[PDB]
Amino acid sequence: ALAQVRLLWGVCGSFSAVAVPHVNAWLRGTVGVQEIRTVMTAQARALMGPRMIEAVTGHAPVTDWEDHKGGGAAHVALGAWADVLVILPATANFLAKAAHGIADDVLTATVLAAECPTVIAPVMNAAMWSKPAVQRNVDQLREDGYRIVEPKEGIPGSLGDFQSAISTALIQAAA
Amino acid sequence: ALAQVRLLWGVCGSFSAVAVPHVNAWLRGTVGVQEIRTVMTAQARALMGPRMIEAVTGHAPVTDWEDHKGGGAAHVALGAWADVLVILPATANFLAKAAHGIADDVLTATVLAAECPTVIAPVMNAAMWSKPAVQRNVDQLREDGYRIVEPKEGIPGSLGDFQSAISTALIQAAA
Amino acid sequence: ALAQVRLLWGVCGSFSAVAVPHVNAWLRGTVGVQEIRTVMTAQARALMGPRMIEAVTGHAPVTDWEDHKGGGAAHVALGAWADVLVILPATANFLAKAAHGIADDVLTATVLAAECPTVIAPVMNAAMWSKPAVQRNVDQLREDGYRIVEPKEGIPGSLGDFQSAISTALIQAAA
Amino acid sequence: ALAQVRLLWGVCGSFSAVAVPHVNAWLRGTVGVQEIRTVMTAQARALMGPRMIEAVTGHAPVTDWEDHKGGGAAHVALGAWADVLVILPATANFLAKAAHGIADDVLTATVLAAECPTVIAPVMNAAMWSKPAVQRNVDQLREDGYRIVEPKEGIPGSLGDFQSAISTALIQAAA
Amino acid sequence: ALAQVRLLWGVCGSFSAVAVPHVNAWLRGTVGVQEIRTVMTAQARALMGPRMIEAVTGHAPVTDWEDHKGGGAAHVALGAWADVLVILPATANFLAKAAHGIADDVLTATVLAAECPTVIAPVMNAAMWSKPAVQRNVDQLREDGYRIVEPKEGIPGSLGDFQSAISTALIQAAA
Amino acid sequence: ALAQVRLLWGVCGSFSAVAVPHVNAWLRGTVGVQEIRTVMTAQARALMGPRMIEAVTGHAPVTDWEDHKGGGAAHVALGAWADVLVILPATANFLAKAAHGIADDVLTATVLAAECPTVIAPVMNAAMWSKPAVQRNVDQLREDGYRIVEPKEGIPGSLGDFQSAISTALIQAAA
Amino acid sequence: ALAQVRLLWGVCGSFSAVAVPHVNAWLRGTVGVQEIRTVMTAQARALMGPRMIEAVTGHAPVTDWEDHKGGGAAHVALGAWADVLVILPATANFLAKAAHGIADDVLTATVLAAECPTVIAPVMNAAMWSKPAVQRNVDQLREDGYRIVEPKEGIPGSLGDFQSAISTALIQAAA
Amino acid sequence: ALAQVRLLWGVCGSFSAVAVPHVNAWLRGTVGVQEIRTVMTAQARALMGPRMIEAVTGHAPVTDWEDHKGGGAAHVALGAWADVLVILPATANFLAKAAHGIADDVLTATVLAAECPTVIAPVMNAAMWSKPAVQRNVDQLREDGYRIVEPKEGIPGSLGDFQSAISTALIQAAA
Amino acid sequence: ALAQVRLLWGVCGSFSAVAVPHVNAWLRGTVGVQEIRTVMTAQARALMGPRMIEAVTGHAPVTDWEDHKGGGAAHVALGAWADVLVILPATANFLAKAAHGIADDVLTATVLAAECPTVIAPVMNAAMWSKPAVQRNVDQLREDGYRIVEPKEGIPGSLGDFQSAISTALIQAAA
Ligand SMILES: Cc1cc2nc3c(=O)[nH]c(=O)nc-3n(C[C@H](O)[C@H](O)[C@H](O)COP(=O)(O)O)c2cc1C
Ligand SMILES: Cc1cc2nc3c(=O)[nH]c(=O)nc-3n(C[C@H](O)[C@H](O)[C@H](O)COP(=O)(O)O)c2cc1C
Ligand SMILES: Cc1cc2nc3c(=O)[nH]c(=O)nc-3n(C[C@H](O)[C@H](O)[C@H](O)COP(=O)(O)O)c2cc1C
Ligand SMILES: Cc1cc2nc3c(=O)[nH]c(=O)nc-3n(C[C@H](O)[C@H](O)[C@H](O)COP(=O)(O)O)c2cc1C
Ligand SMILES: Cc1cc2nc3c(=O)[nH]c(=O)nc-3n(C[C@H](O)[C@H](O)[C@H](O)COP(=O)(O)O)c2cc1C
Ligand SMILES: Cc1cc2nc3c(=O)[nH]c(=O)nc-3n(C[C@H](O)[C@H](O)[C@H](O)COP(=O)(O)O)c2cc1C
Ligand SMILES: Cc1cc2nc3c(=O)[nH]c(=O)nc-3n(C[C@H](O)[C@H](O)[C@H](O)COP(=O)(O)O)c2cc1C
Ligand SMILES: Cc1cc2nc3c(=O)[nH]c(=O)nc-3n(C[C@H](O)[C@H](O)[C@H](O)COP(=O)(O)O)c2cc1C
Ligand SMILES: Cc1cc2nc3c(=O)[nH]c(=O)nc-3n(C[C@H](O)[C@H](O)[C@H](O)COP(=O)(O)O)c2cc1C
């Protein structure tokens, strides 16, 4: 039943954005998700280049407001469309904006507009992860109902074990 | 005495920015305000275009620091000039920045520098308004002394009943 | 049957272009028109900004020839699509071009290509409206079959009583 | 009493635009006009360069709408300000636009907004002056109340005897 | 004697502009014209591209005033040079400008300066050709001495029978 | 039955690119082909301009990878879409790239990805056509299964008799 | 041992950024620091100009991510390099971002990556310093272990007594 | 001794360029190579973005000639430095250029300048791999001494079994 | 008779382009050639700068197609004008393009259009000269009738003994 679940996938400016192809193959070839739309922060776009993400996912990523066509607006259209929202990788920056309701780009505004199970997979090095401000944001996001997948230590952070959390959200959404 | 009250009017990137000419007619033709200066966020400017706002309000809206002339700085000059400060429409983004003392553009820096009665009229859809982070920001601004005019649901949010709140601030300033 | 009438709406560089969202809500929420496509002159676009018009009307306004996609050309495609053509607001400039068959932008070329009931609602101040050249253009357009909605003088012109003229055209087209 | 007459001076893209400094000295040093504001067409600006006109006349010529600051608009502000309007040199192009109420730049829109004695001094070669279309425009402008100063043939047209026509208009305005 | 006739050829932004090479081959290889200079409107240049026209006709087409080198000006130089003037294809826009003596680009200014037999071959669809304003312009041009070659209906207009009209003008010029 | 054949049409930077509208009129108005998509080399686009080709073929020509939308990449998507591939006119440059499996722009990459009847119609002058390297490429392309329409000598080459070759390919595809 | 302490120096967009050369002279000529690297916010760079700071500090200030060379990333590299981190002057804006773990430019990302004694010297006028949001941010940073040097009000704030706090930080780092 | 082998790594504009981070981790963390420098084609750079490649490999990739500093030139310096040269992924385009000695960018010029064991790993879809010209290029490169790792068919080609070929080349170079 | 031989001289992006002034003086002051026109590749222009070649040879080099004026095209005009064609210095890249009939810039297209004795003087280092692909291109060009002047090893290649080969070509052309 996962084939009709609409997965919205946000990508932030982290080293781990290089994992996007591998994660996309897992989502499509192992989990069986069919409808995936991506939103890139401006920093993610500058590091990875948005054109290859488009070719490998089948949709141009949304980065600028101008990418939404017609009535309404990118964050409302994407927020209403999403059955599951995954932010992977998330930056420490994203955690702060999401925890405090900041909405100064397409991704963080879409967070305010989405009403669906949401998984956030932050990545950063150990010094950043240990800062009290970062941990306050992690705690705040959990109290607001977001599923946080803590990073691992791949020596330089790396993605945590997100597969189970994402599958849980997809199954909850399918139900 | 309402003709000498100096009204600073901030405009954020909301659907409801199209209401600015209408609100301006109400401010001038019904309330009797004469001296009105506007500050637009970059997003408001990108959606609405500043040249028509200039034509109907009599002053070019300030968006970049470059729009302030001479000594000081835009936020200090506008902040000291204001007898009443109105943010209409305010974005969810604005609420987050004002609640936490962020000052990363002219408008939010002017908020820190202004010392006058302030009315904030946020606009956003129902999904965004219901987010815990947004409501924390609303509550925090009320605790800090800001007057919040809650949005309506105009089917896609719409401006609340701001006329009474703004009139009260203009009259309190006249005294 | 008014929901199937295809309304083409031209917008010129007048002060009254700020009224476009209000007129759009009236057309949709009261008259019941569903398919509305807009053409903005370069001057209208420079004053009002097309991105907010796009967001509230559901279609990007056409200004440059490049905005039409595929075969043909913007004026032929838009002219053939239209069941009713409304120019609101119209400039004095527009009256001169339409009256003499000038076609030096998309809007005035579409006028030549459209074969449907057309309502023109010019706006300008009293000095401009009284010019002999302007009145010759008004007279000539009426002789050519165009419905002219004369402006009011709301102190600086304002839109006349167009609702009856537009309703008539939508109803005549529905038949 | 001619020193308080406000002279609005339009300049078109003619060979005879080189006479603007000489005419400016005559207007100020011989006729005694004190308040002179210039409007240049885009073509006039491209041939003559706008910065020197500013340095020798004391005011930046208006060419783009952006040159008007504050409320309203260039054509209304200049049109209401003018006590006498002089177009010198005028192009054949200008005659056509003025004769038909075309208002597609600041100059020709200001013509529609001005309500004062107006002198037009066209310049062009003999082949152009003799065209039936040009003479229809000359006749139409005279019937509309404009004073036309016909060119001479200085071998390639040259300015006619405009001094008497301008002086008459300034005197009519003073009364 | 047709080899010494100087043919000035204006090209407007019509679907039929693709015929310029074919007409050029006919003029050179069948009629025997040797000296052919082209003027393109800005819209014609935007559609057809002047570099290919230059390569097949032997002269760079003139579009901007800057394309004329040395003393004088493009419209005077080209107008005095022409023994025959052909506008092919002509737009509805051109008919309006030529009929009313508008001279707001090189081509329409050259029309005012040329004193030679002139052939105009307009192209437009049936709806545009049927407009009263267009037919007024056609009638006015015929009264002023211009030869109009009415279009065909090639299904989207197509060029009329210009071969006879142009040959006649070229032979008339040779005499 | 030829109306559903998907024709992919490459255009190279040759003098004979001016023939594209004529060939298109024959393909659409006589043969009945309905879906025609073009790929222009950078040189073809710079000489001919893509805007008119778009207007008469119904699709914007593709030159840059970004001109193609969505997943798969331009050469794979266009190569798979094509039922017939026609290169007309082809440059000597193209023959060389096609003969050697060079794929350094969209067109030559699309050649590698296309699996359909293909007609190549080179045009060049006699000196270029006689070069040994050029004739090696022609021979090599014939051995690889491509249908070559050799140019004629039309004073400077001209297109050969391509209609029969193209008709044959369109019929093979429908079969 | 103070000559080997690696001092990372962040500069925000405050009036007091003009004091950077004087503070640099004290750090080098009186305290004895040798290796000083600066990070400027975009607003600081726009105010002070990074070329003179480079000339007097010996290193180009880092503002954009592109300034870091090789592996890793500016914030990790600068954050790991720093033995002491000084923000002087800090804006109210900086206080908000640092207090909430926002990392939306190089400077604030480096704060999260740094693991060293940090001194923050905010500057702002009296109205801004008295805002509740600003004072919450000051308190939060103190609880997080940051040393805050409160501003003075030299009539428009001015730097507080940072010499004691910075010398303390530099000396502890040498130990 | 594999840690001192200098590996030069060329990257072409293929879908499989997203595997560059994964392949880099294997080269560093499993094979133990320490000095790896990359050269990207313009198309590879446009797809993947060189900034993330720089951050994860420790060296900015070379794409433009300007990236070489000092005497000589990029292709000579990189070609002499290389102990093993790996092109992964290689495009069909690369195969053609390398097979025919074309050197029209940094990568293909470096191939001519390198004198070391070279492994080429082409990727392309099944239609492209089966083209006769492509297979001629594969055969020619093998005859010239290049190691070709044929692609796989991962349904859109995928990298072949390069691990064995690269390990062999690195080990032979260490010996 | 060598003073009337028209020498066309192509310059590629090699280190040895610094020899162009020396070769030009030898050609003019010692051999006596009077009519010399140069063609530079984009790479030659980017390395050497085109302005000084113009100053020292008396002609601006042709690099872009836009440099040819009037009918035809740069490669046809230059190819027909040439009595002798010299490529000095030639790159390895040039050898490949000439050997395979590639014509993707003005120079390599002029090679296809030229019908005259041609001397090619390649320069490259020893590693590049020894590549099988390069020697295949040398061999193919000799079989096609081109005179190849092999480089020397100036320790980094240097021009071979071209004087005899060029003199032979110029003298044969005079006959
Ligand atoms: C190459 C590179 C890798 C980065 N990786 C991370 C990361 O893994 N986690 C993180 O919090 N920030 C990382 N950053 C810093 C962020 O990109 C920076 O905070 C940025 O402002 C975040 O923008 P965004 O959250 O809007 O995408 C990295 C920066 C660079 C240049
Ligand atoms: C057409 C359009 C309409 C929008 N309307 C709203 C809105 O009504 N309320 C809101 O919170 N955000 C709205 N947004 C999203 C904001 O523009 C976005 O959060 C932006 O970052 C806010 O910028 P600002 O607060 O600096 O003006 C809209 C966006 C677009 C493109
Ligand atoms: C702020 C502003 C408001 C204007 N309002 C009007 C108007 O109401 N009526 C009018 O005829 N011209 C008005 N103009 C002048 C026109 O914009 C000008 O004539 C322009 O050339 C018309 O362009 P268009 O008809 O192609 O839109 C206004 C100009 C400005 C700058
Ligand atoms: C150097 C030069 C001199 C010109 N002189 C005249 C002139 O004297 N009279 C005229 O009608 N046009 C003249 N023209 C042509 C006009 O500039 C042209 O018609 C233009 O479109 C008029 O623009 P404007 O009326 O908006 O200023 C001249 C053009 C050039 C390049
Ligand atoms: C592809 C295309 C074809 C057009 N064909 C015609 C035409 O055949 N006749 C016409 O009157 N207008 C046609 N138009 C509209 C004109 O180009 C438009 O009126 C333009 O402003 C005329 O410019 P010009 O008269 O200065 O060339 C066409 C537009 C496009 C985009
Ligand atoms: C006006 C013009 C016409 C040309 N005609 C031809 C031609 O007919 N045949 C040819 O092989 N090259 C011709 N060329 C040269 C090509 O444009 C040149 O070789 C170019 O590099 C080919 O680019 P493309 O194959 O990617 O389209 C012409 C060049 C110009 C400027
Ligand atoms: C000339 C000038 C001086 C300023 N001085 C201060 C200041 O002293 N303190 C402050 O909090 N903001 C000051 N501001 C406002 C900040 O520049 C503004 O908040 C900005 O967005 C901060 O950017 P940053 O924190 O990234 O450096 C000043 C602005 C200007 C134009
Ligand atoms: C998204 C995308 C993926 C591509 N993947 C391949 C590929 O895997 N193999 C291939 O031969 N060409 C592929 N191409 C086409 C090449 O990019 C094209 O041939 C290009 O000119 C090669 O450039 P290069 O060899 O200089 O890197 C792809 C193109 C795009 C836009
Ligand atoms: C400074 C410099 C010197 C070069 N010298 C040579 C050379 O002597 N021989 C060669 O084959 N390539 C040389 N190259 C590489 C060529 O410039 C490269 O192959 C280029 O793509 C050739 O372009 P062209 O043949 O169109 O001129 C050099 C490159 C640079 C940056």
Task: Say whether I30 counts as a known binding-site residue.
Answer: no
Task: Say whether E15 counts as a known binding-site residue.
Answer: yes
| Structural contact between residues I16 and I10, judged by C-beta atoms closer than 8 angstroms | no
Q: Which chains touch A (3 or more CB pairs under 8 A)?
A: B, C, F, G, H
Atom 4 (ligand 7) nearest CA: G14
Nearest chain A residue to C61 by CA: give it.
Answer: A70
Q: Which two tokens stand for residue B1?
A: 């005495």
Q: Is the CB of B15 under 6 A from ligand 2?
A: yes
Half-sphere exposure of F88 (CA within 13 A, CB side): 31
Dihedral of CA atoms H101, H107, H109, H110 in degrees, nearest 10, equals -110
3-state class (DSSP) for residue I72? coil
Distance CA C109, CA C12 (A): 14
- Asked whether the beta carbons of residue D73 and residue C127 sit closer than 8 angstroms, the reply is no
I112 Cα nearest atom in ligand 6: 11
Distance CA A46, CA A33 (A): 27
Atom 21 (ligand 7) nearest CA: B104
Question: F40 Cβ partners below 8 Å, 6+ apart?
Answer: F10, F11, F48, F50, F53, F61, F62, F63, F107
Q: Which chains touch H (3 or more CB pairs under 8 A)?
A: A, F, G, I
Q: Which two tokens stand for residue B2?
A: 């309402």
Distance CA H162, CA H123 (A): 11
Distance CA C74, CA H138 (A): 49
Helix E106-113 × helix E74-81 angle, to 10°: 50
Q: Is the CB of A104 under 6 A from ligand 2?
A: yes
Q: Is the CB of C158 under 6 A from ligand 3?
A: no
Q: Which of D48, D91, D120, D137 to mutate to test the pocket of ligand 4 (most atoms within 8 A of CB)?
A: D91
Amino acid identity at F30: T
DSSP chain E: -GGG-EEEEEE-SSGGGGGHHHHHHHIIIII---EEEEEE-HHHHHHH-HHHHHHHHSSPPB-SGGGS-SSS-HHHHHHHH-SEEEEEEEPHHHHHHHHHT---SHHHHHHHH--S-EEEEE---HHHHT-HHHHHHHHHHHHTTPEE---B-----B--SHHHHHHHHHHHHH-
- Catalytic positions of G, please? 75
How many Cβ atoms are within 10 Å of H132's Cβ, its own excluded?
Answer: 14
Kindly list the strands in the beta sheet with F84-90, ordered across the sheet, starting from the edge strand earlier in the chain.
F35-40, F6-11, F84-90, F118-122, F147-148
| Structural contact between residues A102 and B96, judged by C-beta atoms closer than 8 angstroms | yes
First to last CA, chain A: 9
Distances (CA, A) of I157 to H110, I40, I91, I132, I139: 15, 20, 11, 18, 19
Question: E9 Cβ partners below 8 Å, 6+ apart?
Answer: E36, E37, E38, E39, E85, E86, E87, E88
Question: E164 Cβ partners below 8 Å, 6+ apart?
Answer: none
Half-sphere exposure of C153 (CA within 13 A, CB side): 6
How many Cβ atoms are within 10 Å of G83's Cβ, its own excluded?
Answer: 18
Closest CA to C73 of C103, C102, C32, C28: C103
Amino acid identity at B4: Q
How many Cβ atoms are within 10 Å of I126's Cβ, its own excluded?
Answer: 13
Question: E60 Cβ partners below 8 Å, 6+ apart?
Answer: E50, E54, E67, I69, I70
E54 Cα nearest atom in ligand 6: 1
Question: D99 Cβ partners below 8 Å, 6+ apart?
Answer: C133, D136, D137, D138, D140, D141, D144, E100
First to last CA, chain I: 8
Q: Which two tokens stand for residue B72?
A: 């000081």
How many Cβ atoms are within 10 Å of B22's Cβ, its own excluded?
Answer: 14
Question: A128 Cβ partners below 8 Å, 6+ apart?
Answer: A92, A134, A157, G103, G112, G113
Kindly list the strands in the beta sheet with A6-11, ordered across the sheet, starting from the edge strand earlier in the chain.
A35-40, A6-11, A84-90, A118-122, A147-148
Question: I16 Cβ partners below 8 Å, 6+ apart?
Answer: I89, I123, I157, I158, I159
Nearest chain I residue to H105 by CA: give it.
Answer: I93
Distances (CA, A) of C141 to A83, C87, C100, C134, F135: 54, 13, 9, 11, 65
Q: Which two tokens stand for residue F157?
A: 């080459």
Burial of E86 (0-12, 13-18, 19+ CB in 10 A): buried
Amino acid identity at E144: D
Distance, CA D13 to ligand 4 centroid (Å)? 4
Q: Is the CB of A124 under 6 A from ligand 1?
A: yes
| Structural contact between residues E119 and E171, judged by C-beta atoms closer than 8 angstroms | no
Question: G130 Cβ partners below 8 Å, 6+ apart?
Answer: none
Distance CA D73, CA G56 (A): 49
Atom 7 (ligand 9) nearest CA: I14
Q: Which two tokens stand for residue G119?
A: 């001194």
Atom 30 (ligand 4) nearest CA: E73
Distances (CA, A) of I67 to H158, I14, I24, I78: 45, 23, 21, 11
Per CB-CB distance under 8 Å, the chain C contacts of E133 are 98-101, 112, 144
Question: B73 Cβ partners below 8 Å, 6+ apart?
Answer: B65, G15
- I36 strand-pairing partners: I7
Which residue matches tokens 């005028």? D90
Region label for C101, one of left (φ > 0), alpha (ψ between -120 and 50) or beta (otherwise): left
Question: G9 Cβ partners below 8 Å, 6+ apart?
Answer: G36, G37, G38, G39, G57, G86, G87, G88
Q: Which residues line ligand 5 (CB under 6 A)?
A: C 65, 73, 75, 103-104, 109; E 12-16, 41, 43-44, 47, 91-94, 123-124, 128, 157; F 55
Mutation target to probe the F interface, by most F beta carbons within 10 A, among I67, I107, I112, I115 is: I112
Expressed in Å, this structure's resolution amounts to: 2.2
Region label for E151, one of left (φ > 0), alpha (ψ between -120 and 50) or beta (otherwise): beta
Q: Which two tokens stand for residue D56?
A: 């020798």
**DSSP 8-state assignment for residue D158:** B
- Asked whether the beta carbons of residue H92 and residue F73 sit closer than 8 angstroms, the reply is no
**DSSP 8-state assignment for residue H30:** I
Helix (H) or strand (E) holding B68: none
Strands F147-148 and G6-11: unpaired
Q: What own/partner pairs with CB < 8 Å and gap ≥ 24 does F148-157 have?
A: F148/F120, F148/F121, F148/F122, F149/F88, F149/F119, F149/F120, F149/F121, F149/F122, F150/F122, F151/F121, F151/F122, F151/F123, F151/F124, F153/F126, F156/F15, F156/F125, F156/I76, F157/F15, F157/F16, F157/F123, F157/F124, F157/F125, F157/F126, F157/F129
Per CB-CB distance under 8 Å, the chain C contacts of F54 are 70-71
- Asked whether the beta carbons of residue A56 and residue H19 sit closer than 8 angstroms, the reply is no
Please say if E75 is a catalytic residue: yes
